[PDB]
Amino acid sequence: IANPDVSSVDYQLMPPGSVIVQPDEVSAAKMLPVSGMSKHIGKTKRLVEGDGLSDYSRL
């Protein structure tokens, strides 16, 4: 669920270097195949193989 309600991280107050942005795949063709299933875009990312289990039960 993890949702903060009253919450804003400014990301303009940070020092000029320390805003880093990373894209999993830097391509057009591989972010979306012709068919619907996707591992990045849409709700289709929900249906990747793996990640079905959970490791937070250690608490």
Binding site: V21, P23, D24, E25, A28, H40, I41
Partner: protein, 164 residues
């Protein structure tokens, strides 16, 4: 999809006339400048991934506020849509370099982009920051060639002048 061929065919067709020597001189010029355009298209198809990566990285390097509150790229997903969009723009620059007119770039990329961009709150200045970064990352003798490099600059400048 506008090119030399479609311009002179479209014009001589609009007159209802057989294609005279003028049209033949036009396509003569197309096959003169062709080798430069195809050279820059080959090299763009060579290293497009580093081009898009450096382009988007400088795009968030300038405007950091996008990944802050954001009414912008505010997830890894939207940054993936960012680098997808830069992939599309570079792919259309490749297409316009192969056709040799601004045809596919205008009819696929530029036409009606402004309603999408003002509707989905997407700022144009970020794209302009990306393209000006790539245009400053050009080389005179090093990466492409002098003359074809100029062709590439022209195409990218068209994008900027269509967006601002």
């Amino acid at each position: 999809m506008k090119s030399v061929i479609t311009t002179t065919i479209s014009a001589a067709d609009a007159a209802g006339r057989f294609p005279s020597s003028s049209d033949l001189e036009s396509i003569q010029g197309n096959i003169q400048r062709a080798s430069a355009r195809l050279e820059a298209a080959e090299k763009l198809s060579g290293n497009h991934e580093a081009v898009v990566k450096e382009a988007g990285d400088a795009c968030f390097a300038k405007y950091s506020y996008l990944k802050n509150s954001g009414e912008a790229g505010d997830s890894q997903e939207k940054i993936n849509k960012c680098y997808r969009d830069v992939d599309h723009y570079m792919r259309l620059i490749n297409y316009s370099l192969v056709v040799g007119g601004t045809g596919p770039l205008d009819e696929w990329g530029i036409a009606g982009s402004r309603e999408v961009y003002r509707t989905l709150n997407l700022p144009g200045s970020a794209y302009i920051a990306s393209f000006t970064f790539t245009r400053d990352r050009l080389c005179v003798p090093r990466d492409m060639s002098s003359q074809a490099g100029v062709e590439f600059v022209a195409a990218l400048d068209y994008v900027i002048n269509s967006l601002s």
